Design a protein around this nucleic acid. Structure first.
Ligand SMILES: [Mg+2]
Ligand SMILES: [Mg+2]
Ligand SMILES: [Mg+2]
Ligand SMILES: [Mg+2]
Ligand SMILES: [Mg+2]
Ligand SMILES: [Mg+2]
Ligand SMILES: [Mg+2]
Ligand SMILES: [Mg+2]
Ligand SMILES: [Mg+2]
Ligand SMILES: [Mg+2]
Ligand SMILES: [Mg+2]
Ligand SMILES: [Mg+2]
Ligand SMILES: [Mg+2]
Ligand SMILES: [Mg+2]
Ligand SMILES: [Mg+2]
Ligand SMILES: [Mg+2]
Ligand SMILES: [Mg+2]
Ligand SMILES: [Mg+2]
Lengths: 116, 60, 131
RNA sequence: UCUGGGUCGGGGUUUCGUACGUAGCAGAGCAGCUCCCUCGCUGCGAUCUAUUGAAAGUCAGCCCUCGACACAAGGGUUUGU
RNA sequence: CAUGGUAAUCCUGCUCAGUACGAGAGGAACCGCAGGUUCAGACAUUUGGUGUAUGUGCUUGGCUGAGGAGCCAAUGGGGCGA
RNA sequence: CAUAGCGACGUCGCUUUUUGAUCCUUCGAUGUCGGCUCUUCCUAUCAUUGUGAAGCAGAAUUCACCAAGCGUUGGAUUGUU
RNA sequence: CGUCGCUACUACCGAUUGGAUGGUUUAGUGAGGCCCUCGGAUCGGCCCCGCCGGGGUGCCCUGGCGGAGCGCUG
RNA sequence: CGAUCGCACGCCCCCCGUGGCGGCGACGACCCAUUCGAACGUCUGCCCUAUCAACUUUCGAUGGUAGUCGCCGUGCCUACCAUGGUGACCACGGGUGACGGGGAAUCAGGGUUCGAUUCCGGAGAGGGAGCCUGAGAAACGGCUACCACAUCCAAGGAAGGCAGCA
RNA sequence: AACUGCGAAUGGCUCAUUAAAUCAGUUAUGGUUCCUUUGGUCGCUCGCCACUUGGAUAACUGUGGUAAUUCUAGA
């Protein structure tokens, strides 16, 4: 139930098994048995040994779209308010665009008359 | 162990302190951006699948 | 408190180990181990955390033809650590101290065994890392 | 005995490390074949890859079989208050 | 069970306690705790050693026409090894 | 301050781990130093257990008693003891 | 004038396979950075096209959940 | 081959009347030229030393050809060739208590010493080495690694560079 | 406050290294680069958003980890 370690071979090391190596440069390795340890000590690459986990993942041995959009009330307007504004599709927006045109045109014409 | 649970669609994140390792071993040995059904937390967390997004070490 | 458990010694009298401090000494030649009552024909041997008497063989000439107290910090012999792990290091090493335990040097190169670290708090502070 | 213990076989465990053969437009290249092809095909070639954590061993002092086969109420020598 | 043999040993650290004692410098002990030394009797879960399981790869010289499969070199050598 | 601890001038002993003295055994031969190995024994006790005394405040030490259960080491030089 | 005797000081030789500090290098190991060949933990677009849908009129303009095309790709 | 930001604010109205037009700028740009420069080159010039007379050439030393690389020209590097190249007119090697110069001291003339030091050029940031960014750095009041010193720590880690002013 | 742009490669200090090296005068780059300033050039090209397109991230709200640092993560 202690820390679970992994070897030169990448295998799982249970407590009371294997040995631990502490190099002078400060790195600590752990080995499952003398086979995995001596392979490490002979400067042998684990990716070239067919029973090593690192080899099997390199050679691949034995081996979606999510999108959700939500509407949230913001500071100042509730979800009820923003729903009403976006649900003015049946000619309510048309009334807004035509009242904007006539008001802006009548203000523009009156501004030209204000100067003389 | 503390858990920083957050709901994206409502905000309102909160921090929950637990100490039962049986409830957290369903999270153990899982990578980030993975979803694990968090039904092991009591009885109220049923129907919930939660995604690991980050964390901190003992030293921060 | 807590006392040191028994460990495999591995370093008898006559062993030459590295000198991991910066005193200018390069190696330490172990001549005896402190606290060893002994037995007929048995060489006094030392593990990590053991205090020894040592003479440096190569290094500064002001340290050479003298007897120095030293403490082993690393050993190449595997030793069981009461929880299954059989730890061993890349080399044997030790540092020069005095009888009180203060280190003559001011820095340690490489790791220091946990057995030596919590037995000599003066050494542990100077240790770069604990293995 | 409500059988027995053997011998093979099987399964497990474990050791080593990926078998022979076949296939590849893999392969330093080389030697041949061009009405030919419009970039081609025929050999030799260590090694590589897939088949293949494969192949091989594993009680003789490993574990479990209830699969198959035969054999086991046989032999000899003695022993009395 | 008559009888015979016979076995355990010593030390350190913490605490007591910078305490008693002492002008000061210095400086204990009993109980308790954690460990060692030497010795003794075992044991192989683990680590290490061995290793001709002649177990399985690698490899030199030669030999079976070649491949495959092997063998010989007083254990050919070497790696890992139940 | 004779006797905590020493003991002059003298005097009484013990031991056979020294070396002498002698020549009883062995000259038709008892293999003659040291080391290594291994067992046991003695106590005239270095340490440990229990104690007594001091010029024993503590620490350290010294003297003495019961006491041989247990231990008494690794090395440089030297054939060496 | 030189030897010898005393006292100061200065160098020289000298066993010590003497010692120490610079510099330039052979060989061995070798951190780290850069380049190259891979690698692809993740994050996305398109193909959505199980559906409620639809408009010039099942022939979808699509208003969203969600299946997920189990592919083409950044 | 401008999807950028301000300032006053105006003209045309026939097609009408809602659009098209407008100046002063700022910012931005591939390229060109200039400016500040930078980088590598040409010629001449340096102290003591021969108790340094022959050096260089494996591993480039000298040249040729073809390239690679760099911002470019060049053995800068690679391959294939030729055996060259420098020296008593002092090479090469060693020392320097040597950063170089403009300059300073002494002063008949000629000369002899000193220039670390405010101007110019170079170099360096404890010693080496390697890079990110940027037009420009092999930068250190940037980073990475090692070496040496050194800092805090709950010992799991983290952080250094006064030959800048004090 | 933060994103963006610019500077931080100048200045200041020191003289260790360095003996055709640095450096001084002279000359070349017809063998190169050059932010910025300055002046050119920017309708020279036939080719269902343009009355203005796409997504994220800071600062900010909130939940934190560590003993610690000008450390930062998740939403
Ligand atoms: Mg002996
Ligand atoms: Mg079987
Ligand atoms: Mg008895
Ligand atoms: Mg052969
Ligand atoms: Mg064969
Ligand atoms: Mg034969
Ligand atoms: Mg072996
Ligand atoms: Mg006689
Ligand atoms: Mg007589
Ligand atoms: Mg005889
Ligand atoms: Mg005899
Ligand atoms: Mg007695
Ligand atoms: Mg100098
Ligand atoms: Mg000067
Ligand atoms: Mg200057
Ligand atoms: Mg510089
Ligand atoms: Mg710039
Ligand atoms: Mg630098």
């Amino acid at each position: 139930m202690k820390v679970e370690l992994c070897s030169f071979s990448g295998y799982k090391i249970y407590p009371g098994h294997g040995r631990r190596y502490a190099r002078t440069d400060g790195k600590v390795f752990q080995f499952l048995n003398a086979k995995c340890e001596s392979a490490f000590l002979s400067k042998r690459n684990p990716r070239q040994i067919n029973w090593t986990v690192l080899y099997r993942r390199k050679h691949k041995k034995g081996q979606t779209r999510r999108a959700v959009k939500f509407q949230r009330a913001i500071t100042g307007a509730s979800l009820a308010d923003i729903m009403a504004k976006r649900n003015q599709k049946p000619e309510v927006r048309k009334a807004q665009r035509e009242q904007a045109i006539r008001a802006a045109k009548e203000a523009k014409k009156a501004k030209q008359a204000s100067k003389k | 162990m503390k858990l920083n649970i957050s709901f994206p669609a409502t905000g309102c994140q909160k921090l929950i302190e637990v100490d039962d390792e049986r409830k957290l071993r369903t999270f153990y040995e899982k990578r980030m951006a993975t979803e694990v059904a968090a039904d092991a937390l009591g009885e109220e967390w049923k129907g919930y699948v939660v995604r690991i997004s980050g964390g901190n070490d003992k030293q921060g | 408190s807590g006392a040191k458990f028994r460990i495999s010694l591995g370093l008898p009298v006559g062993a030459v180990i590295n000198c991991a401090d910066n005193t200018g000494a390069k190696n330490l030649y172990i001549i005896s181990v402190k606290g060893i009552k002994g037995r007929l024909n048995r060489l006094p041997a030392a593990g990590v955390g053991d205090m020894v008497m040592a003479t440096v063989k190569k290094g500064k000439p002001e340290l050479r033809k003298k007897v120095h107290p030293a403490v082993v910090i690393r050993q190449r012999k595997s030793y069981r650590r009461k929880d299954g792990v059989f730890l061993y290091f890349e080399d044997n090493a030790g540092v020069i101290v005095n009888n009180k335990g203060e280190m003559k040097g001011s820095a340690i190169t490489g790791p220091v065994a946990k057995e030596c670290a919590d037995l000599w708090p003066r050494i542990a502070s100077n240790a770069g890392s604990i293995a």
